[PDB]
Structure 1
Amino acid sequence: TAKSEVEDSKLSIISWNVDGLDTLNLADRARGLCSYLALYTPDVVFLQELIPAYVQYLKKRAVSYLFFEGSDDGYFTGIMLRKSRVKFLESEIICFPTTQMMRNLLIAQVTFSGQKLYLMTSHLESCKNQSQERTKQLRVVLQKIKEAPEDAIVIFAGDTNLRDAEVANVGGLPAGVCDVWEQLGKQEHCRYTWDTKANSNKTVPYVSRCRFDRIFLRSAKTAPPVTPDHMALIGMEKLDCGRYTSDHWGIYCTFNT
């Protein structure tokens, strides 16, 4: 098939923890997010730390998307699906029994470019000290990826809060599942998604750089595998209010679907 039919069949996603818990300039920052969505027109958006006012705003502005949320109050995750590109089939939420932070796993099954996709997001248990709970949640996520319908491509994207050796400590990713940043070459340029030296939204006594935001991919077991195409960190511009959209950078990523 020709170049343009191929470029049109490519899936695009954005994953972003929007820091809805930071009340400062929140309306301006939601406007910022919307400007990025208009720029990148992603097929799927995976969001974390939404709060009701924020998602209400998005639903009023981003009317070309269908919305699903991980909760109706507090703070929660969301999946947005571009209606002209992605056909919604069904959704569900899987609970994390031992979370103290209302965390869970939000799943949407869809059709895209003639293929079934299983789209997942979570905001895994926060803070270094919560390595144990986070790890448990990671296991659930990975199990759900392994077990997804054999004919589906699985894409999890979210704020994993994972740090050094936590994945290695569960034996690494299972066969058939890759971390997209790893698969694209472990590039330093687009590695850290939370960087308190570079991002001035929070004042912090000690700076750190972490790769909290991650994308895991599993191809269909019954079809040829798909590769990621390209990834970039986004949101590294300040808004008119003099702050960034979030204390995280977003990930923009395409796949050769």
Structure 2
Amino acid sequence: DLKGFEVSVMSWNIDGLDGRSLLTRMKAVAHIVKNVNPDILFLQEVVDRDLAPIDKLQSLYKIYYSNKGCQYYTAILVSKMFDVEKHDVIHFQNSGMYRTLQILEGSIGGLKVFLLNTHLESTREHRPQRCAQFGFCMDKVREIIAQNPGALVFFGGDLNLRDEEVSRVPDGVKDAWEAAGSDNKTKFTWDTFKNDNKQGFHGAKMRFDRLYWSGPLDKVKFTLEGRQRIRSCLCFPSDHWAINATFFA
């Protein structure tokens, strides 16, 4: 049965586009990953420069990059026990920012698993593109679910959402943070009040980073990670907190 079955999914925009203290920050990212030790890890805004500390995680994970060599891209890292069946990268047709829906399909044990990682169009101005992408992603999730009854499906990443932007979420698909209890202490994943990696914002807080799921696991625990300043350079690993969700029966 699925009782005692448990899988953890972590997602993090690692702010690779910010060149300041990039190597130290990527080392910190890899450090935090090894300590949280998630089964599955989604990354966004990964860059080629100073990727080594991340790439070195291949001793612990299989690493799939959405579009390596592009200005920035996403990654999905899975346990070496994850049996990969397909890796598909869908380029959003309406994107001016090389954004993609990265899909890794496989299984761990006997359980079919679909992993969908994205970084939706950025900024208030691109609401049109972003809302269309989200809808498109949900349609894809709806289809995967229909085609694979009994599968675990995880969809998320940096969705850049304001709540009023969330559209057609299928019944059966739940938001991990909400299902864990809509805890205020774990709500905002991009918090310019507390995160000072970026200047010029003036106290904006958003729940940009989210994880949705469908499947035979009905309970979820949800925490934030990467919230500690790096001592040597006095910055956070990223201007985003990581989200960390543990799904169980």
What is the Cα-based RMSD across aligned positions, in Å?
Answer: 1.7
Q: Is the 8 A contact 1:34 1:62 kept in 2?
A: no
1:67-216, aligned counterparts within 5 Å?
Answer: 67-72=63-68, 73-83=70-80, 85-148=81-144, 149-151=147-149, 152-167=151-166, 170=167, 172-216=168-212
Q: Secondary structure at the match of 2:164?
A: coil
> What displacement does 1:16 show?
0.2
Q: Secondary structure at the match of 2:8?
A: strand
Report what 1:248 is aligned to.
240
Q: Is the 8 A contact 1:184 1:230 kept in 2?
A: yes
Q: Secondary structure at the match of 1:52?
A: coil
> What displacement does 1:158 show?
0.2
CA distance in 1, matches of 2:52, 2:28: 15
**TM-score normalised by L of structure 2:** 0.93
Report what 2:39 is aligned to.
43
Task: Give per-residue Cα distances to partners, 1:67-106, cap 9 Å, x unaligned.
Answer: 11111221011100111x4222221011200101110100
Count how many residue pairs are aligned between Structure 1 and Structure 2.
244
> What displacement does 1:122 show?
0.3
Q: Is the 8 A contact 1:16 1:48 kept in 2?
A: yes
Q: Structure 1: which 5+ residue stretches go unaligned?
A: 220-224
1:234-245, aligned counterparts within 5 Å?
Answer: 234-240=225-231, 241-245=233-237
CA distance in 2, matches of 1:139, 1:106: 15
Q: Secondary structure at the match of 2:49?
A: helix
Q: Percent identity?
A: 32
Change in CA separation of 1:55 and 1:156 when aligned onto 2, cut-off 3 Å: farther
Q: Structure 2: which 5+ residue stretches go unaligned?
A: none
Report what 2:18 is aligned to.
22
Q: Is the 8 A contact 2:192 2:201 kept in 1?
A: no
Report what 1:222 is aligned to.
none
**Most deviating of 106-115 and 44-53:** 106-115
Report what 1:66 is aligned to.
62
Q: 1:226 aligns with which of 211, 217, 223?
A: 217
Aligned amino acid, residue 81 of structure 1: V
**TM-score normalised by L of structure 1:** 0.90
Q: Secondary structure at the match of 1:244?
A: coil
CA distance in 1, matches of 2:19, 2:223: 27
Q: Secondary structure at the match of 2:93?
A: coil
> What displacement does 1:60 show?
2.5
